[PDB]
Design a protein around this ligand. Sequence first.
Ligand SMILES: Cc1cc2nc3c(=O)[nH]c(=O)nc-3n(C[C@H](O)[C@H](O)[C@H](O)COP(=O)(O)OP(=O)(O)OC[C@H]3O[C@@H](n4cnc5c(N)ncnc54)[C@H](O)[C@@H]3O)c2cc1C
Ligand SMILES: Cc1cc2nc3c(=O)[nH]c(=O)nc-3n(C[C@H](O)[C@H](O)[C@H](O)COP(=O)(O)OP(=O)(O)OC[C@H]3O[C@@H](n4cnc5c(N)ncnc54)[C@H](O)[C@@H]3O)c2cc1C
Ligand SMILES: CC(=O)OC/C=C(\C)CC/C=C(\C)CCC=C(C)C
Ligand SMILES: [Cl-]
Lengths: 471, 470
Amino acid sequence: TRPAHAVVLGASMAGTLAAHVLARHVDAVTVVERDALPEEPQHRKGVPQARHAHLLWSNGARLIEEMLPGTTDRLLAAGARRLGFPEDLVTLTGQGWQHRFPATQFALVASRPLLDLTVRQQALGADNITVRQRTEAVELTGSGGGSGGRVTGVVVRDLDSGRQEQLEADLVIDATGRGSRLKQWLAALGVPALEEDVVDAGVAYATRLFKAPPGATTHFPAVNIAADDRVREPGRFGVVYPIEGGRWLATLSCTRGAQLPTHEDEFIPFAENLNHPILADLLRDAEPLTPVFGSRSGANRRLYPERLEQWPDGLLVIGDSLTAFNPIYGHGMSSAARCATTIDREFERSVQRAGTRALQKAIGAAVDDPWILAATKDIDYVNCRVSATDPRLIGVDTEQRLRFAEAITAASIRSPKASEIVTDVMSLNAPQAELGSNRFLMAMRADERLPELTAPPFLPEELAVVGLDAA
Amino acid sequence: TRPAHAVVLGASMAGTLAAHVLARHVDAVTVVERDALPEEPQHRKGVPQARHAHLLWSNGARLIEEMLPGTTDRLLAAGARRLGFPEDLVTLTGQGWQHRFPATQFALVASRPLLDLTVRQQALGADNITVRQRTEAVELTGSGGGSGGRVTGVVVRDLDSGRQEQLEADLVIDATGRGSRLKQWLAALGVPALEEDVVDAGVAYATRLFKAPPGATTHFPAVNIAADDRVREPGRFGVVYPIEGGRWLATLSCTRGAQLPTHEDEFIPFAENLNHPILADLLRDAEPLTPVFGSRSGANRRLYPERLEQWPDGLLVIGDSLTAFNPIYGHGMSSAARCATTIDREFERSVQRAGTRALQKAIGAAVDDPWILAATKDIDYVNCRVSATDPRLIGVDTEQRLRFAEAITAASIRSPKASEIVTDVMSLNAPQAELGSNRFLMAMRADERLPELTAPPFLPEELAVVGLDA
Ligand SMILES: Cc1cc2nc3c(=O)[nH]c(=O)nc-3n(C[C@H](O)[C@H](O)[C@H](O)COP(=O)(O)OP(=O)(O)OC[C@H]3O[C@@H](n4cnc5c(N)ncnc54)[C@H](O)[C@@H]3O)c2cc1C
Ligand SMILES: Cc1cc2nc3c(=O)[nH]c(=O)nc-3n(C[C@H](O)[C@H](O)[C@H](O)COP(=O)(O)OP(=O)(O)OC[C@H]3O[C@@H](n4cnc5c(N)ncnc54)[C@H](O)[C@@H]3O)c2cc1C
Ligand SMILES: CC(=O)OC/C=C(\C)CC/C=C(\C)CCC=C(C)C
Ligand SMILES: [Cl-]
């Protein structure tokens, strides 16, 4: 018999997309969210990462567009911007400035609260979706361990009354994010511990919101400075992204060993000590609208429920709860869209439980691309904490992995054919392994390499919008 | 290490597509084929089924088009026809005539030798593909048994010289077809026996090519008769497809228990004893160009190498050899395209040996749709021989499967919304399980049902091109 009631824990991007998908296949869906969901673009404590710069890469943007047609146009009408890569960005890599080749990929950029609200407005309006705001999931009900175990429902607590209730379900979806209590819920059902890979470069983030020079959010590119050209030293990075309302979102980041700004008067000096001070020059006369927001959620971690024999029937885990990545590569929301898309494409085949386990295996395969990309890039940072069994990571020459990464970067910034393939991998539209293919290696040697840029490739009319001259 | 030499055993559609794919990722590929590959459309002993009706459904057509751009345009320029479903077909089901709704899917139809050569011409021209024509693979080399072995190469015979030769390889692809010798090659390295699911309704086929009335191949629909409305006696079917050169391809079919025309003067009598005699009335004044070609390759069979722990490294199996289906549903070439597309999509991720089995598991998952579709439809035929472990087949009440198949068919022929989803499953673009989805059940209840057609839905101008009335 088919499932008739599904419960989705968490109403952020992973839970909202899964709720919309499951409503097409299940008679009734209940969404359990700890926060009150605002009706206007507004931050909330359940998604504290929304304070920092967010790119929706073309992989997630297309997956969301095919699930919810019109979403992209609604975002743009609300002030979001479609950044073309590498065309609409002034980017400094460890190998030099990126030539602004005609765009081969894109990313939608906006405030994360606007993007969350726009998606919620297009997904949660179905008649068979019930949203229980200000309701907290406390534990799962059912049985675990041995064989034959299965999750029957979830205990929820109403936060305005304090009363608890048993919410029975044929299917429970954990989408509660990086701070998820899944390991406690599992152990309370007698389920053994899950396998977990971790690659933790100790990345932290400091963000301020600025009023951009008038017109810059439309006629000035995004700027990204990534300083990693030495490997015995921690990485230090910085981005300035345009968002709706004529505002600049500036996010500074560093790996373990470096020092982030903890006060407002340390923000611009950090940008002045990157490999090029262009982010400081842009933000020197810009009006700050916020204090400095911080984040320490920069580890790469992946659970493998698809490997656990004692995985209970009727339970799935998606989003940051299943796996989370270093935000610098900006794949979290695309991974959430992949989880919902995989449920949509595999649900009917997986029912008629071999279905719950088949869905979880399909979900695990869909999140491999953002995992192996972020972990490959972070594993070689100095003082990185590594605890993973992935043979693509652990059994690899460390000199050769670094040298090859440098060669990939050197080709992408100055070779059109190499840049196109790299943006495919960067946009999560091609696996990381494609950079080791015969196709990429032949493109890397055969393609032309343009001369090295000795200054940031701003067009003069872009410098005129922000009131600068000669880089 | 990244494979530097791959060998594909067998040409035809599975081998040709896989060879084109592997050439993108491996330095050199060898294609070893028993027959001489002709440079113009001609049948051959290695693919004797090419004499029978062949539809390239949109699933395989799109996968081939994305692999080999321009192939669809060359086929149409060479005389192939893009039949829209259900618009361009007059089809009689066990529930009645199919309303010719605007096309929601399509299939390319032409002679199989023409389609084969067109794909060969656009796939095997790469500089790093070497074709060993008139060369036969006899056995595999390597190790097997115990811990799980590994494949080193293949022994080949040159047929114009008579010489044997050892061809080592980092990766061997079996694309030999339904009569493939893989299970003996396995035992020859001591690899345990593979799991196999079989649903064999004993389907046989008789085909005669006719010269169609001038213009019929372009302005007249294909006709498909499925005489299937009783479950206690064998099914008998018949189709007439247009192909290039102004010719009609007529393929007659039956399941175990019935008798096909095995003599030429019984061919049209078989067509007049279908549930409607329209295919006989079409073929009585038609000029016969061939004798009747026969085939008894109508069983559904699936190997499960993805389940065998001791599967040797460096070996993959694709096409009809891995799994074959009842031709009546026409998914074999689309399944061959799926295996090649899956190899292309997963190859780089699978290397960087865990790769060969990762590729084989991905290939096995891609061939599930045509297997469960053909097996679900064939399992309940009278005197059908079943040897399978698939719980989607074994643990099903047969009344519930029979009743639902009738409701799916009755909805598809007279409800537009239901027809759209059914053609998606029929064209192999949606899994069979979609017909049990809440989405499909809601479409069946909510959508209108048009009145029953009491006559074949020919337009008056279509009857006039073939010279009939009513
Ligand atoms: C600094 C930073 C920058 C990032 N930048 C990007 C970027 O540029 N691009 C990108 O794609 N991704 C980015 N990410 C990742 C992205 O924010 C997440 O991947 C995305 O939010 C998906 O997470 P999720 O929906 O699974 O969980 P979350 O977004 O964390 O949401 C979890 C939800 O569950 C709720 N919840 C928690 N516990 C309970 C409970 N017990 N009961 C009920 N509800 C509960 C919470 O209130 C919340 O609504 C970034 C992350 C960080 C930290
Ligand atoms: C009557 C009938 C009708 C069909 N109709 C359709 C249809 O409408 N649509 C559709 O999509 N499919 C149809 N099929 C299925 C389709 O023919 C096959 O699925 C398709 O050809 C894929 O098979 P293959 O390439 O894997 O193997 P095959 O096409 O059988 O090719 C195997 C090749 O390997 C070669 N070979 C074999 N052994 C050796 C050896 N030892 N050494 C060297 N070379 C060797 C052979 O010479 C041959 O060239 C039909 C099949 C039949 C029987
Ligand atoms: C040197 C290196 O890291 O190579 C990869 C660099 C990339 C992929 C560009 C850097 C991207 C960012 C800093 C994103 C902005 C920050 C957040 C979304 C939190
Ligand atoms: Cl955060």
